[PDB]
Design an enzyme around this catalytic site. Structure first.
Site, PDB file in Angstrom:
ATOM      1  N   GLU A 158      93.540  -1.845  41.872  1.00  0.00           N
ATOM      2  CA  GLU A 158      93.768  -2.597  40.627  1.00  0.00           C
ATOM      3  C   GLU A 158      94.741  -1.790  39.766  1.00  0.00           C
ATOM      4  O   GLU A 158      94.471  -0.628  39.426  1.00  0.00           O
ATOM      5  CB  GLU A 158      92.471  -2.797  39.821  1.00  0.00           C
ATOM      6  N   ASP A 205      88.075  -3.970  27.344  1.00  0.00           N
ATOM      7  CA  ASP A 205      87.798  -2.742  28.076  1.00  0.00           C
ATOM      8  C   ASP A 205      86.922  -1.761  27.344  1.00  0.00           C
ATOM      9  O   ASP A 205      86.750  -1.840  26.125  1.00  0.00           O
ATOM     10  CB  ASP A 205      89.102  -2.030  28.459  1.00  0.00           C
TER      11      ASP A 205
END
Length: 244
Positions: free
Chosen positions: A36, A47
């Protein structure tokens, strides 16, 4: 998109610079089932702290969108490990969906995860992704209900990415419950981003059905500390997590 039992490194593009990122990818490829690559964003509100700071670093050092493509393209010369571009919608929207996805493909991207894809746009996005040859990766958190996991699984062509903002230092129960619900629902393979930091986490998660385990924060924490010289430390943390 990856073999069962796969460890999936997550790295932020341009943290601390695009050459180093490339270096980190080449060093971790031998342990990766897939990778990723995150496109840093000014407001990565989805996040956890560690990854948010890496976005800040990358941007401060002057990261530019297409440098992400440069990274993928250079990596491609050396390897065929599937790369999933992880991004916020803003960059894609401003650049034009098809243009972006098209450029993504041309550089070697295999799949794309749009963290905050507006439901209103899911359909057309997935159609364009398919047309452009890019596999879709959708995200689901512990607060995602069974009905949505299903709608998510039906739109997914890459794999379902299960996350936990919970942090940990044990995998929270709510993370395991998400995993258990997904396996009972998803036909696509599932990968989990539950912030692993110990070998027991990887073992357990795979044992509970995760087809793959993403390792991001752990890796990103070392990069935030070691900078360009993170490489070797990265290889040790992955080996530790793999029991080797």
């Amino acid at each position: 998109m990856f073999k069962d039992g796969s460890l999936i490194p997550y790295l932020t593009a341009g943290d601390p610079d695009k050459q180093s990122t490339l270096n980190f990818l080449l060093a971790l490829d031998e342990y990766a089932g897939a990778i990723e690559l995150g496109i840093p964003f000014s407001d990565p509100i989805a996040d956890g702290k560690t990854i948010q700071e890496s976005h800040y670093r990358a941007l401060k050092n002057g990261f530019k969108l297409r440098e992400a493509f440069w990274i993928v393209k250079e990596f491609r010369r050396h390897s065929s490990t599937p790369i999933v571009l992880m991004t916020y919608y803003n960059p894609i929207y401003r650049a034009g969906v098809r243009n972006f996805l098209a450029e993504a493909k041309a550089s070697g991207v295999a799949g794309i995860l749009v963290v905050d894809l507006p439901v209103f746009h899911a359909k057309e996005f997935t159609e364009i992704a398919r047309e452009e040859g890019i596999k879709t990766v959708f995200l689901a958190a512990p607060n995602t209900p069974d009905e949505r996991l299903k709608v998510i699984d039906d739109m997914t062509t890459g794999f379902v990415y299960l996350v936990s903002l919970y942090g940990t230092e044990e995998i929270p129960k709510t993370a395991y419950d998400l995993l258990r619900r997904a396996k009972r629902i998803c036909r696509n393979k599932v990968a989990v981003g539950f912030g692993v930091s110990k070998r027991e986490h990887v073992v357990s998660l795979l044992k509970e059905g995760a087809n793959g385990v993403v390792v991001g924060s752990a890796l990103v924490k070392i990069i935030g500390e070691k900078g360009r010289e993170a490489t070797e430390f990265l290889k040790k943390k992955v080996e530790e997590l793999l029991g080797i």
